[PDB]
Amino acid sequence: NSVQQQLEALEKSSGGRLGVALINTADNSQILYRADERFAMCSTSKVMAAAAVLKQSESDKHLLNQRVEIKKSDLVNYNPIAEKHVNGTMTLAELGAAALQYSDNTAMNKLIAHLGGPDKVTAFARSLGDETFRLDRTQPTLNTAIPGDPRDTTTPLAMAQTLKNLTLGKALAETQRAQLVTWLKGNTTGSASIRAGLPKSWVVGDKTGSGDYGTTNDIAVIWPENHAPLVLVTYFTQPEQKAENRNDILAAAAKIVTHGF
């Protein structure tokens, strides 16, 4: 029972398509399963929009405190933080935090509107060397996750490399890097995903995403107690539009690939 065989068996019994990329930053060794295939990102794409705004703040000291007005008209489907500020204002930093830690969709759309559109998020990704990421739509329609649709997709390997560069590497200056890591560590939505497959004392920063076709994603940076960090991307999708989301498959996959660390 090698890792590969265990993942193939998990995928087969699950009835879907699983994509995994683990980077072990101690020796840059990788564990890959369908890591070259495109998957709908769903709300894991919120990390790239928040990071694009942090990049702007490197050269503009006042940006993150800029205020944005929240009107009743700005609310889409899932806005647990923005609805508490209707008629009020939120700073760009508070929108970043809400988008990542609660997956607030109004917060994401405001960040995209500030940047000038989804093509500007793609151009940010390209500036990091990510040739794979593409963002095409806003919330909530970037969650349609139609099989074979290239829109709003990336690959597990590209996203694992980019998330390493963002949280641990060259992509952001130190204060901005640290702020992104703080937001990911504060996530409230990932208890039953990757985190549930790991030892309870490891420190995890993650961003979930779910959508149609039972599409269930999580991307994480993992800090073991006595080892270098690991970056893990788990994507999962299924062939029926109304399939149930399967966070338990992500937890299982994370348990398989971290057996040994």
TrEMBL record:
EC number: 3.5.2.6
Family annotation (PROSITE patterns): BETA_LACTAMASE_A
Domain of life of the native organism: Bacteria
Positions of the Beta-lactamase class A catalytic domain: 20-234
InterPro entries membership: Beta-lactam/transpept-like, Beta-lactam_cat, Beta-lactam_class-A, Beta-lactam_class-A_AS, Cefotaximase
Recorded catalytic activity of this chain's protein: a beta-lactam + H2O = a substituted beta-amino acid
Any matching Pfam family: Beta-lactamase2
Example of a GO biological process term: beta-lactam antibiotic catabolic process
Keywords of this entry: Antibiotic resistance, Hydrolase, Signal
One Gene Ontology molecular-function label: beta-lactamase activity
UniProt cross-references to PANTHER family, sorted A to Z: BETA-LACTAMASE (PTHR35333), BETA-LACTAMASE-TYPE TRANSPEPTIDASE FOLD CONTAINING PROTEIN (PTHR35333:SF3)
Family note: Belongs to the class-A beta-lactamase family.
Protein name as annotated: Beta-lactamase
Protein's organism: Escherichia coli
Lineage of source species: Bacteria, Pseudomonadati, Pseudomonadota, Gammaproteobacteria, Enterobacterales
